mmCIF file of C-alpha atoms in Angstrom:
data_model
loop_
_atom_site.group_PDB
_atom_site.id
_atom_site.type_symbol
_atom_site.label_atom_id
_atom_site.label_comp_id
_atom_site.label_asym_id
_atom_site.label_seq_id
_atom_site.Cartn_x
_atom_site.Cartn_y
_atom_site.Cartn_z
ATOM 1 C CA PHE A 1 -75.290 145.115 94.509
ATOM 2 C CA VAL A 2 -75.280 145.315 90.684
ATOM 3 C CA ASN A 3 -77.095 147.525 88.135
ATOM 4 C CA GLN A 4 -74.553 150.377 88.319
ATOM 5 C CA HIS A 5 -71.577 151.632 86.269
ATOM 6 C CA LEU A 6 -68.096 153.062 86.986
ATOM 7 C CA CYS A 7 -64.729 154.303 85.576
ATOM 8 C CA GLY A 8 -61.776 156.364 86.830
ATOM 9 C CA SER A 9 -62.665 157.032 90.485
ATOM 10 C CA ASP A 10 -66.014 155.172 90.387
ATOM 11 C CA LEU A 11 -63.949 152.094 89.491
ATOM 12 C CA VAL A 12 -61.221 152.314 92.152
ATOM 13 C CA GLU A 13 -64.156 153.388 94.336
ATOM 14 C CA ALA A 14 -66.522 150.489 93.588
ATOM 15 C CA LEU A 15 -63.470 148.196 93.486
ATOM 16 C CA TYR A 16 -62.646 149.531 96.964
ATOM 17 C CA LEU A 17 -66.153 148.707 98.255
ATOM 18 C CA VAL A 18 -66.336 145.104 97.049
ATOM 19 C CA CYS A 19 -62.805 144.443 98.348
ATOM 20 C CA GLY A 20 -63.072 146.986 101.188
ATOM 21 C CA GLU A 21 -63.296 144.771 104.294
ATOM 22 C CA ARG A 22 -62.286 141.341 102.970
ATOM 23 C CA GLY A 23 -59.269 141.284 100.628
ATOM 24 C CA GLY A 24 -56.907 143.733 102.366
ATOM 25 C CA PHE A 25 -55.302 145.259 99.251
ATOM 26 C CA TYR A 26 -56.126 146.824 95.865
ATOM 27 C CA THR A 27 -54.395 145.951 92.573
ATOM 28 C CA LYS A 28 -51.469 148.318 91.967
ATOM 29 C CA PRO A 29 -52.215 149.615 88.464
ATOM 30 C CA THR A 30 -49.634 151.238 86.157
ATOM 31 C CA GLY B 1 -58.319 146.247 81.013
ATOM 32 C CA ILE B 2 -60.693 146.411 83.959
ATOM 33 C CA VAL B 3 -62.539 149.599 82.940
ATOM 34 C CA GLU B 4 -63.458 147.884 79.665
ATOM 35 C CA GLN B 5 -65.179 145.144 81.703
ATOM 36 C CA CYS B 6 -67.436 147.090 84.104
ATOM 37 C CA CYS B 7 -67.424 150.478 82.327
ATOM 38 C CA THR B 8 -68.732 148.714 79.197
ATOM 39 C CA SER B 9 -71.303 146.440 80.870
ATOM 40 C CA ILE B 10 -72.909 146.327 84.327
ATOM 41 C CA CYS B 11 -70.737 143.732 86.098
ATOM 42 C CA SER B 12 -71.934 142.103 89.342
ATOM 43 C CA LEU B 13 -70.223 143.049 92.612
ATOM 44 C CA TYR B 14 -69.093 139.405 92.508
ATOM 45 C CA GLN B 15 -67.189 140.048 89.265
ATOM 46 C CA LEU B 16 -65.272 142.821 91.027
ATOM 47 C CA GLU B 17 -64.353 140.331 93.739
ATOM 48 C CA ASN B 18 -62.161 138.816 91.008
ATOM 49 C CA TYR B 19 -60.749 142.299 90.303
ATOM 50 C CA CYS B 20 -58.657 141.735 93.448
ATOM 51 C CA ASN B 21 -56.587 138.888 91.964
#
């Protein structure tokens, strides 16, 4: 689903929804 | 980095799929 925005939590949050099931990881920032 | 990609424009959930690279 598009048409939304993010940042800080919203990012790690949206990023955690798109890669929630599939993927099996995150990114490891900093 | 990544915040300057979706926080600046409305990216598609498919673009985030690449965020997990």
